[PDB]
């Protein structure tokens, strides 16, 4: 089941990036593709499905890889990228929680 | 070892001089688990992994919580063994997941 039903369509999530800051390296179209919509503060985004938030976007960052890095059990992510992809990314970062708790 | 001067059990109990009497976990249970008081609220850190714990509600086990949040702690494993750590880890498989929902 979905966390934000109003942002289920690409068109809608993509509609929120109207005043997405120019200095942010990642583009609104990659973000909307990954299910992320702009919450209207700084560069904070949320996924319409898992309600998982992401911020501090830097050059090279991949919305799909980050989605799998931080919210691996999101139904939408699995369905679009597959369990293999999620397993691989989760494979790269086994000590994520530990690293947060430093 | 993060804090060499909190190595001994006796040095650890000493930091609980200004420990609040309202917090329902005694300095004894906390010093045995490797924790010393850092002087603010009820924040404690382990002399080894430097893991920090707070918000001690009633019925909390310093050893269980050590295993819960800092399972790779050498001191925790030496005192309680890898089996205890695995058991508590299985009781909480989605720990990082529950953090990021807030
Ligand atoms: Zn998601
Ligand atoms: Zn420790």
Author numbering:
A (entry chain A): 254 to 355
B (entry chain C): 255 to 356
Copied sentences from the primary study:
The suppression of caspase activity occurs in the presence of specific members of the IAP (Inhibitor of Apoptosis Proteins) family. In particular, cIAP1 and cIAP2 (cellular IAPs) are indirect inhibitors of caspases activity, whereas XIAP (X chromosome-linked Inhibitor of Apoptosis Protein) is able to directly inhibit both initiator and effector caspases. All IAPs host one to three BIR (Baculoviral IAP Repeat) domains that are critical for their anti-apoptotic activity. In particular, it has been shown that the XIAP-BIR2 domain is responsible for the inhibition of effector caspases, whereas XIAP-BIR3 directly binds to and inhibits initiator caspase-9, which can also be recognized by cIAP1-BIR3.
The four independent BIR3 domains display very similar structures, showing r.m.s.d. values in the 0.29 – 0.46 Å range (calculated over 101 Cα pairs). The divalent Smac-mimetic heads bind to both cIAP1-BIR3 and XIAP-BIR3 in the conserved IBM cleft, between the β3 strand and the α3 helix, roughly lined by residues Gly306, Arg/Thr308, Cys/Asp309, Glu/Lys311, Asp/Glu314, Glu/Gln319 and Trp323, in cIAP1/XIAP-BIR3, respectively. In both structures the two heads of the ligand adopt antiparallel orientations, with distances of 17.0 and 11.8 Å between the N1 atoms of their triazole rings, for cIAP1- and XIAP-BIR3, respectively. In cIAP1 the linker segment is in contact with a hydrophobic surface built by the C-terminal α-helices of two BIR3 domains, in particular by residues Leu354 and Leu355. In fact, the higher affinity of XIAP-BIR3 for the bound ligand can be explained by the cooperation of two distinct contact interfaces, namely BIR3-BIR3 and BIR3-9a free head. Such hypothesis is supported by the existence of a larger interaction surface area for the XIAP-BIR3 dimer compared to cIAP1-BIR3, as assessed by the 'PISA' program (association interface areas of 652/459 Å2, and ΔGs of −6.9/−5.4 kcal/mol for XIAP/cIAP1-BIR3, respectively). Surprisingly, analytical gel filtration assays performed on cIAP1-BIR3 did not show any peak shift in the presence of an excess of 9a. The resulting chromatograms showed for XIAP-BIR3/9a the same peak shift observed in the presence of an excess of inhibitor, and a peak shift of about 1.3 mL for cIAP1-BIR3/9a (from Ve = 12.9 mL to Ve = 11.6 mL). In fact, after mixing together the protein and a large excess of the inhibitor, an expected behavior (K1∼K2) will be the saturation of all the available BIR3 domains by one head of 9a, hampering the formation of dimers (no variations in Ve), as observed for cIAP1-BIR3.
